[PDB]
Amino acid sequence: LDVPSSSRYDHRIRYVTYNPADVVQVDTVLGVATHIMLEEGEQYLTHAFGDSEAYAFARKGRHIFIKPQAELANTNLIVVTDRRSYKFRLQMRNDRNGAMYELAFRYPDTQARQTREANARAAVEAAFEQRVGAYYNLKYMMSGDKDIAPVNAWDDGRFTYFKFSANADLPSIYFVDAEGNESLVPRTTVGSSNNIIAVHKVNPKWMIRLGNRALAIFNEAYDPNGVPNDTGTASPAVRRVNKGGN
């Protein structure tokens, strides 16, 4: 028999932690409405009263209001939703003291969850901003149009970066195979001033185009080996785990 525990401002607000194998004691005092609040998005199925007429019931979504309406209101409520089955022991109090106005069901499992992913997200963001333990290549040569010339180009072994000054237009970046044909690669833009365009590969030969001006970039320190990406992310500090289960 779980006893609701009151808040430290008033005794009329009480909290109770759920239990599948225990019923809830509610001492209903005369003349008050009691608010029972379900889980967010709890789907209502059915109730059951020890006396339909000793108590007045009204529901909206996950909200319940109960009120004494007959003498000697001492019965039980078994309200069942999709997820569980609440059990309330409705005992009417005689001296109309010690009312409850809302009852709360904190679920320790759900609170434990909510705490977890917040800490996890903080850790993930911290790990990403750590960005330590990498090598950087700068053996890059360029040929052709220099008016689309990036100011710096490099690679961290997984991504290739180009940097353009403030006054130039950001061109399109193209991937060259060994044969000489071009093709598409996904690109993303990063930086304080969006002046770095990053592509998702390291390749010996890059081609840059803008209208009818074409520029070629040679990666002259190509690493066929590269660093394998076991962690499943852009940084070796974070894994990628399967939530979906099944």
């Binding site: 991504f159 996904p186 993303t188 998702h200 990406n229 992310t233 852009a234 990628r240």
Partner: peptide, 12 residues
């Protein structure tokens, strides 16, 4: 033939 990264460029 390549890992498809998220738009943030941080996840496979």
């Amino acid at each position: 033939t390549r890992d498809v990264y998220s738009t943030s460029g941080r996840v496979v």
